[PDB]
Amino acid sequence: KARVYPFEDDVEVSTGDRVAPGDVLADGGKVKSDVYGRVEVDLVRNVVRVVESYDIDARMGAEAIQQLLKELDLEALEKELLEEMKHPSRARRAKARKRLEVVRAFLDSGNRPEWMILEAVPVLPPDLRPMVQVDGGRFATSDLNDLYRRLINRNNRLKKLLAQGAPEIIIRNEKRMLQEAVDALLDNGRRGAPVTNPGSDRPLRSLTDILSGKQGRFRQNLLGK
């Protein structure tokens, strides 16, 4: 489905461009285009095809999400919920009133709802995750230290792939793999944990496991210093 347009001599806008309506498409502003779409510019037969298509900012990833949370206005969503407040009562208030309290507490601290989404990942100082040598020229290290490596190769491999300007399908798969990665570092087990490839199927003690002493560490905690 494409509105074809033929040209006599001159032609502006190349294949890949996005047009309409009444936009100068060819011949010093004679042949214009009506409908929205992707331009084709047939090299052989002189006819600039405009393929029936929109241009929609419709995104996946926490990128899309991160945006919304900037684009959100609290002030608004507080008072706009204050109208939602106690009007259907037993239905679309009971939930729309819980929603409110968050906005309030968000507004009570001074946190932009975007700071929940991560773009700069901090990294635990190295000493409390050491790489010590023990016996027989063999070392010992943390899971944290192996959780970070697997993250980076993926962010690093993304920079290559994005630089390369590869097809979106694969630009995606790497981001999926990057969410999966940051997940398993921040809190490894909330989606089916990864392990030290061969060795055993022991899940890797993630910053989450570490803080709440998930594996018999909070029971060890109260065994004191």
Binding site: K1, S53, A58, I65, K175, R176
Partner: protein, 113 residues
């Protein structure tokens, strides 16, 4: 909570299965101008920001329309019997047969009684 996005909704946007919109202006197969939110899949997206396209195969036979290899109306027949379910532009691909017709002109000698 803060985005009236469900539990499951939040997945398909954060783990890459359904696109959440932000700025649109469009309505295909819905007839509905889809608003500044809410999710849609690949074969939905590959229709909106790509367009409706369909390729079709053939055995070693004949075209029966590439002479009219420019335009087509829904269900129009071509070749031995193919019919495309789309209303737009029919287009050539990989030519195997091309006839070259050589227009020539000479001058004749005559003598009638």
């Amino acid at each position: 909570t803060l985005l009236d996005l469900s539990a499951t909704e939040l997945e398909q946007v954060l783990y890459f299965s359904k696109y959440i919109v932000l700025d649109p202006k469009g309505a295909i197969l819905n007839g509905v101008p889809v608003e500044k939110r809410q999710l849609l899949t690949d074969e939905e997206y590959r229709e909106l920001r790509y367009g409706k396209q369909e390729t079709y195969p053939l055995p070693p036979g004949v075209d029966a329309l590439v002479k009219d290899g420019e335009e087509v109306v829904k269900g129009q027949e071509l070749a031995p019997g193919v019919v495309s379910r789309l209303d737009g532009v029919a287009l050539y691909r990989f030519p195997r047969r091309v006839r070259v017709e050589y227009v020539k002109k000479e001058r004749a000698g005559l003598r009638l009684p």
